[PDB]
Amino acid sequence: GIFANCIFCLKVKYLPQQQKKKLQTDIKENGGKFSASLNPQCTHIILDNADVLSQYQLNSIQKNHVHIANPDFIWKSIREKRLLDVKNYDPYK
């Protein structure tokens, strides 16, 4: 699937539970892995609009080349049946 070799940290606490779960199933059904925690193995961190990151988290993200994206990265990649440009979905840029 399109998310093969992707490891997503999900910070989507303020999404409806049904959307959190759809994110998870969309990731797993298309070859991805997801985690609640941020670590060096993460390739991506998905952040809903109301979730924020600490300076510590942002430094880890920079150091480990983690891509910061919003949920639309997942939704639209699934819809288009193709991994999109994550640079177009960065809430911090």
Swiss-Prot record:
Tissue: Widely expressed; the highest levels are in the kidney; also detected in heart, placenta, lung, liver, skeletal muscle, spleen, leukocytes and pancreas.
Domain of life of the native organism: Eukaryota
Short motif Nuclear localization signal, span: 16-22
Ranges where the BRCT domain occurs: 1-91
Compartments, as annotated in UniProt: Cytoplasm; Nucleus; Cytoplasm, Cytoskeleton, Spindle
Record function comment: Mono-ADP-ribosyltransferase that mediates mono-ADP-ribosylation of target proteins.
UniProt subunit comment: Component of the vault ribonucleoprotein particle, at least composed of MVP, PARP4 and one or more vault RNAs (vRNAs). Interacts with TEP1.
UniProt similarity note: Belongs to the ARTD/PARP family.
UniProt name for this protein: Protein mono-ADP-ribosyltransferase PARP4
Organism: Homo sapiens (Human)
